[PDB]
Amino acid sequence: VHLTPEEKSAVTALWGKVNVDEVGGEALGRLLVVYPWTQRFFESFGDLSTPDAVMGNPKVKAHGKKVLGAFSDGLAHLDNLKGTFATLSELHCDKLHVDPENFRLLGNVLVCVLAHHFGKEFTPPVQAAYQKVVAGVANALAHKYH
Amino acid sequence: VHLTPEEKSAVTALWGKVNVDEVGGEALGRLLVVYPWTQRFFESFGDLSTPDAVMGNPKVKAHGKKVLGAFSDGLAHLDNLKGTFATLSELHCDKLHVDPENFRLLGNVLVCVLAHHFGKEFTPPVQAAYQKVVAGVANALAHKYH
Amino acid sequence: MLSPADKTNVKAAWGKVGAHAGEYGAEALERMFLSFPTTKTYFPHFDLSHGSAQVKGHGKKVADALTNAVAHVDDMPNALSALSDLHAHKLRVDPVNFKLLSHCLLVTLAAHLPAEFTPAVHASLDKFLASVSTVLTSKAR
Amino acid sequence: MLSPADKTNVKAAWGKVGAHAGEYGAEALERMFLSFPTTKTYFPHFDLSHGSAQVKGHGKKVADALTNAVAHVDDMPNALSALSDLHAHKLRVDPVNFKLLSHCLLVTLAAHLPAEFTPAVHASLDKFLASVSTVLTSKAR
Numbered sequence: 001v002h003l004t005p006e007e008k009s010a011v012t013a014l015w016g017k018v019n020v021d022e023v024g025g026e027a028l029g030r031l032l033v034v035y036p037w038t039q040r041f042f043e044s045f046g047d048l049s050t051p052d053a054v055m056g057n058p059k060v061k062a063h064g065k066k067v068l069g070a071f072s073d074g075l076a077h078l079d080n081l082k083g084t085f086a087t088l089s090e091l092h093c094d095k096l097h098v099d100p101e102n103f104r105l106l107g108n109v110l111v112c113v114l115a116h117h118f119g120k121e122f123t124p125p126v127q128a129a130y131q132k133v134v135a136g137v138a139n140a141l142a143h144k145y146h
Numbered sequence: 147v148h149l150t151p152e153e154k155s156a157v158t159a160l161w162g163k164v165n166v167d168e169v170g171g172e173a174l175g176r177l178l179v180v181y182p183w184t185q186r187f188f189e190s191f192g193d194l195s196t197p198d199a200v201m202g203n204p205k206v207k208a209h210g211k212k213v214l215g216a217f218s219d220g221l222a223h224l225d226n227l228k229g230t231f232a233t234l235s236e237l238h239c240d241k242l243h244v245d246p247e248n249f250r251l252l253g254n255v256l257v258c259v260l261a262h263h264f265g266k267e268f269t270p271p272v273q274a275a276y277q278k279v280v281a282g283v284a285n286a287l288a289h290k291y292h
Numbered sequence: 293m294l295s296p297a298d299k300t301n302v303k304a305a306w307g308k309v310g311a312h313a314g315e316y317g318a319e320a321l322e323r324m325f326l327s328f329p330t331t332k333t334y335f336p337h338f339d340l341s342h343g344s345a346q347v348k349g350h351g352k353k354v355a356d357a358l359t360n361a362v363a364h365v366d367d368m369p370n371a372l373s374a375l376s377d378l379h380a381h382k383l384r385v386d387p388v389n390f391k392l393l394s395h396c397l398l399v400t401l402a403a404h405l406p407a408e409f410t411p412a413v414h415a416s417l418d419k420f421l422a423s424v425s426t427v428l429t430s431k432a433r
Numbered sequence: 434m435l436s437p438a439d440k441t442n443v444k445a446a447w448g449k450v451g452a453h454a455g456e457y458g459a460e461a462l463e464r465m466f467l468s469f470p471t472t473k474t475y476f477p478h479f480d481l482s483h484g485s486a487q488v489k490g491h492g493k494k495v496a497d498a499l500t501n502a503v504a505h506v507d508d509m510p511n512a513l514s515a516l517s518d519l520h521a522h523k524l525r526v527d528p529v530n531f532k533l534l535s536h537c538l539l540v541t542l543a544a545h546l547p548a549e550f551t552p553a554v555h556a557s558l559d560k561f562l563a564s565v566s567t568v569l570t571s572k573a574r
């Protein structure tokens with residue numbers, strides 16, 4: 001993206017404090033709860049009938065951890081996201097058939113989760129840096145669609 | 147942009163048949179009519195009260211020609227829309243305060259006008275190429291916003 | 293909110309589509325798949341090749357529903373309740389895609405109804421497809 | 434549409450905002466200006482500096498309007514008619530910008546209501562801001 005050095009440091013500093021397992025589960029769960037249409041891809045996950053059903057679903061939690069793991073890796077290759085995410089992009093398109101707009105929704109949910117978790121530490125400018133990051137990842141993930 | 151030589155020829159060839167004067171006046175007028183909030187930037191033009199009043203407004207027509215002229219000149223630089231529109235990007239930002247979302251609206255209006263004009267000739271594949279160009283131009287124009 | 297003039301304009305334009313609605317339904321989809329390749333994510337089970345019978349058939353289906361909405365321009369919510377349900381609870385299409393199809397339908401109409409696709413009619417049809425979109429995405433959550 | 438549940442959720446979280454609405458309104462604007470710079474094109478007449486009184490003042494107005502929407506959760510179209518008219522005819526804000534402020538309002542709330550910002554409340558708040566945005570943009574054309 002367009003990350004100033006000080007934006008890159010701000011991202012990295014905060015990311016250091018994140019429990020990826022936990023934030024992953026929280027972001028994926030909230031996605032399925034706020035934009036229920038996104039549940040379309042997880043019919044094998046079981047009970048997604050209520051908020052508690054979603055948030056506590058062991059399958060949602062595990063998938064969340066998988067997704068945020070892949071995301072954390074992306075954070076180390078902020079220079080080459082498209083490269084980093086190319087095989088995942090191809091997979092989401094050709095095998096999973098996941099509309100890329102889902103990637104932007106997840107990005108927004110993650111920002112809300114980071115705000116939820118960090119409170120005041122998630123300053124206006126720290127958010128502006130993350131906004132750029134989630135956009136970049138979403139773009140990277142959509143790059144191989146055809 | 148990410149135009150294939152084939153998509154390139156398609157654009158280029160259709161364009162050579164365009165009457166910039168008429169297409170520009172119609173694209174701009176249709177914009178003011180379909181999305182009335184765009185009229186906020188043209189208070190000084192006069193009567194925009196009715197479709198008929200917009201479509202007839204000479205100030206509208208002449209602005210349409212100037213806009214399509216610049217657009218037309220950009221098609222000669224498809225490999226660097228960013229550098230071609232850098233100064234215009236800053237102007238739209240810094241002097242005109244035009245929301246870049248308008249660039250997108252105009253692009254779609256332009257595609258509707260070309261289809262209207264070329265009927266049969268404006269095939270799905272020719273449209274796909276134009277869609278890439280309008281998106282590319284809007285992106286370049288919004289590029290220096292801060 | 294469609295004005296009396298809008299409903300008029302829509303009824304007029306659609307009146308001319310007539311026996312070609314199905315063909316236009318089909319061409320709009322074709323234009324969509326080509327221009328906005330992400331929309332294909334919802335049709336993995338279809339043959340998306342040019343002139344595919346699946347696309348043709350679906351084009352018809354979309355057209356007929358638009359026809360039914362024109363006939364009930366006054367009672368859209370009610371006329372398309374079943375379709376709103378299907379899309380909301382079964383298909384689960386992301387709302388952004390409705391804007392893409394709408395634009396492709398406009399383009400298609402422009403290309404085929406030269407005389408009728410005036411600035412006023414363009415505005416009304418845009419508003420119309422927007423209202424149809426709203427109805428189809430209203431029970432999404 | 435907002436369910437009874439949504440309504441309870443919204444009154445509850447907004448309840449908690451209380452006397453901080455103004456400050457949170459201001460903060461949401463600031464976050465929006467920094468993340469989505471294009472939104473600044475509507476405020477060329479403002480000092481957009483950190484702690485600008487204009488932003489502070491503007492933040493209070495926005496918060497008061499939301500507070501008013503919560504107060505009339507069963508009659509928002511009417512409770513907000515005036516503001517809808519203003520946005521439609523004077524301000525002429527492009528619709529997409531509403532989604533941007535809504536998102537930033539959500540971020541702000543999240544950042545200040547750790548205990549109340551549950552998944553369920555997040556979902557209700559999102560739907561609420563979407564409803565308010567719909568009203569403010571209903572007469573746009």
Ligand code: HEM
Nearest residue numbers: 038041042066067068070071088096098102103106137141
């Ligand atoms: C930050 C964006 C995302 C990243 C980095 C990501 C990453 C991953 C990874 C690493 C996998 C496992 C790949 C494999 O099975 O070989 C996966 C699978 C999957 N992802 Fe994504 N994902 C993201 C967003 C999304 C979103 C937003 C959705 C849908 C709403 C989604 C839907 C799926 C599905 C359905 C699977 C397969 C699940 C299964 O095992 O059945 N992903 N993703």
Ligand code: HEM
Nearest residue numbers: 184187188212213214216217234242244248249252283287
């Ligand atoms: C394809 C996209 C566009 C291009 C290439 C373009 C280009 C231009 C050019 C070449 C000028 C001449 C002014 C100068 O050089 O001093 C101009 C002015 C202007 N444009 Fe854009 N424009 C585009 C889209 C838009 C849109 C969509 C709007 C608003 C809806 C807009 C609003 C204006 C205004 C208000 C002016 C100043 C006119 C005046 O001085 O009276 N432009 N534009």
Ligand code: HEM
Nearest residue numbers: 331334335350353354357358383385389390393424425428
């Ligand atoms: C103008 C808005 C739309 C209208 C009026 C419309 C109408 C319809 C109709 C009439 C059907 C057939 C229902 C049946 O089989 O009984 C249908 C199915 C379907 N629609 Fe929608 N549609 C619209 C927008 C969309 C969009 C934007 C998408 C995705 C990008 C979409 C995806 C689907 C899919 C995947 C099916 C099922 C196709 C099949 O499996 O045969 N629709 N739609």
Ligand code: HEM
Nearest residue numbers: 472475476494495498499516524526530531534565566569
């Ligand atoms: C749902 C969210 C919104 C609410 C509740 C809201 C509410 C208001 C209110 C109460 C006012 C003051 C009216 C008065 O002077 O009495 C106002 C003005 C204004 N709003 Fe909105 N608004 C919203 C969204 C937006 C957005 C998204 C934008 C642009 C990005 C915007 C741009 C403006 C502008 C430019 C003014 C005039 C400010 C001034 O010059 O003092 N509004 N809004």
